[model samples]
Target: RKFFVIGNWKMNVDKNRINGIVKMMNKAALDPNTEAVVGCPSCYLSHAREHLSPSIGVAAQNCYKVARGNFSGEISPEMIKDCGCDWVILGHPERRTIFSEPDSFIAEKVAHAQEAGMKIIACLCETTEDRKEGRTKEVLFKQLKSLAGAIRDWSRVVLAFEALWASNTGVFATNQQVQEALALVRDWLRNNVSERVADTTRLLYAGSVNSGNCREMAALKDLDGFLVGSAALKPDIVDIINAR
Candidate 1:
């Protein structure tokens, strides 16, 4: 698979911040081999799409499950598509933890996203407690199963895995830990989903992924790319895109 990078800006950045990032990314000699996408906040989807390189895709941070209705403060896949963005980041760790979004609900959103013909970076994560209790595989597989069940067209979805304990917590995960989780996720796809889906669908590792560790994680046999956080906003992302 070609290397992929989704720079998830999260709740960070404003209009000016985005312009600076756009200028830097557009002029940089980005790797032709890497598929780069930006996960922008909902409000700036068009602003990002308007200035960023056409080769680089723009994705929504999150979206509601329905097309439209009584849902207040919620953006839908239809709105994201209308904004001229082709991708959406669903089930992010923050949404699952900080916002208390459940697996079933995430799946519902994922299903709607695919049906609406939007590509997705389906995020899955394991908490610090789950890791400490040695339930890493169990928790991840359960989440994966939910995501997989909701996905009908595997071609349009990329599965991202995050170790919540290491995400933006100042503590980085060992290369071995990341590799193991990625391999487990791949195997789950091979067995429960399909060999084709296992081999084709992209797998990205998130959580404290920076310019420093990105090269190492990108070299992992099981990993296809990264879902970056803080580093995505800086020039570090260029190095990450060209890590290969």
Candidate 2:
């Protein structure tokens, strides 16, 4: 399995800051085995891609379902592909909760990206209400089930099972918690979805994934990658990469 580490610099860097960061990353001795990609805000996609090496790829934070024509203040998969992005992140908790992106809408986006030949990092996380009601598995599976049917080409999909509650509260899941959640998720893919799908599609853990706890999470049998946030912003991101 290819261990993936994708950095999401969500709305954090200015032009000069981006340039400096890119330069530093270029000079840094990064691991070649793990698959690495960076998701930047749409405004900085072109700039980041221009400076990024072939080893580092770029992704759009989000893309609309529509293929073309004027959709004011919205970016489509066509636009992202044209801008040289190979991946698109869909159904992030921020987009779902804060922006009110409906599941059906996100489904359409996933379908659109797959049809457009772009790889998808489908972002799913439990909300406060979900955790409060003990619907963590229910909610996560519901989202996964929704996408499983839409995604016929499983090779193009990567699942990022982020814990929203943990991220917001800075409470990383214990090793046992990580193991249990991943086991459940793995079973869902194996029994409910195709075996080929389960094998080809990568499973990643996000939210509060730092250098300290990364190895414990990564050591799990089912976990295939790490979707890093704050830790990716610092030089320790390199450490996170070498965790295994």
Candidate 3:
């Protein structure tokens, strides 16, 4: 499979800006082989489907675990699919930090989302304290371990790695440092997890990713792509897409 570059726009756009940004991205002239997907707010999924370029697929930021029922304020997997979103991002650090979603909850949602046929970008991040305590790999592996059966098909999954300290704190780690961590994570996946998972999954970097450092990160052997933040909302996002 080719490398993928998934732009997670989170909650950045309002109704008026959604159409224009989607138009701009559609006409941005991206690389043919890179599997690019834009995750926009659920409110704009219909509009995104209408204007989104065939080249740039659409995804949902998050969705509820249940297939149906009366969960006010929550979107079900069926709703996301009906809205034309093929992918869904789960376990984002912000979602975990802000909503206090525990690992077990995330694992349950992963199972539900997969059952609903929603391709997933399963995210895992560690705080600076965790890394400082030499527990980054241990923490990440524990998270994935709980989702082992639910994540049966790696072809339908992508791994988004972000160091909590590097993302929200504006502290930048050198590419060498990030790559070392990613390499360690890769080794853990290879030696400790199923080969099908490691081979089919794309290892993506996320913390503070922008056009400026995107190329360096993409150049790493284990790094299959990126999950950009603020850069995804700008024209510079095109540059990040073409970084390799």
Candidate 4:
């Protein structure tokens, strides 16, 4: 399978700005060996879909568990699909920390998103304190366990290991650390799901991923791709995509 690169735009840009970014992306000569997906703010999904190249895909930054309801401000997976998005980014650090979304809530969203015919970029990460206390694996396992019964098809999911501390502090994890984390995820899937799922499911690294360091990060044997943050907003994103 080709490497996957997802640019998570978060809540940074407005609708009109997204138009310019999508235009730039459409003009870039992205690597054919890579699958690039842009995680746009919910409001720009339709606009992004209309402007981005057909080879690229559009992803929702987040979505609700139910297909339709009176959930007031929540955007549902059905609505995301209606906007022509193929993927949804769930369990992001911002969603978990700032919004206080529990792992169970994320699990429910994962199930519902997949049920609504959307693939998911499921995020799992530990805090700086967790890393300092040597509890990285422990924290990651707990988050993974929350998704045990929710993931019906591992093929429709990509696991992203993002260190919240690293993301916030502008310090990236070493390739060795990322490899260990990805290896653990693969082992967990092999034991709980199927060997095929373990072998085929993609594992991505996120947190301060920029053009300057992306090439070295992409060289890691276990890293299947990246989930970028601030760097994803710039034109250098093309450099990150073609790093390999």
Ranking by lDDT: 1, 4, 2, 3
lDDT of each: 0.92, 0.82, 0.81, 0.87
Looking at model 3, the pairs that clash are none
- Candidate 3's displacement at residue 139, Å, is 1.3
- Candidates 3 and 4 compared: the better one by lDDT is 4
Count of backbone clashes, every candidate in sequence: 0, 0, 0, 0
| lDDT (10s digit) by residue, model 1, range 1-244 | 8899999988899999999999999999999999999999988999999999999999999999999999889999999999999999999999999999999999999999999999999998999999999999899989998998899999999889999888667887899988989999999999999999999999999877767777888899999999999889999999999899
Model 3: C-alpha RMSD to truth? 1.5
Best-fitting candidate, measured by TM-score? Answer: 1
Residues 18-90 of candidate 4: C-alpha lDDT, one tens digit per residue: 8878889888888999989999988789988988898999899999999888889899989998988899999
Q: Best-fitting candidate, measured by lDDT? A: 1
Tens-digit lDDT track of model 3 for 16-38: 77777777788878888789988
At residue 46, give the lDDT of candidate 3.
Answer: 80
Judge candidate 2 against the unseen true structure and give its global Cα lDDT, from 0 to 1.
Answer: 0.82
What TM-score do all the candidates reach, one by one? 0.98, 0.95, 0.94, 0.96
| lDDT at residue 6 of model 3 (Cα atoms) | 83
The 10 consecutive residues of candidate 3 with the worst lDDT sum are 146-155
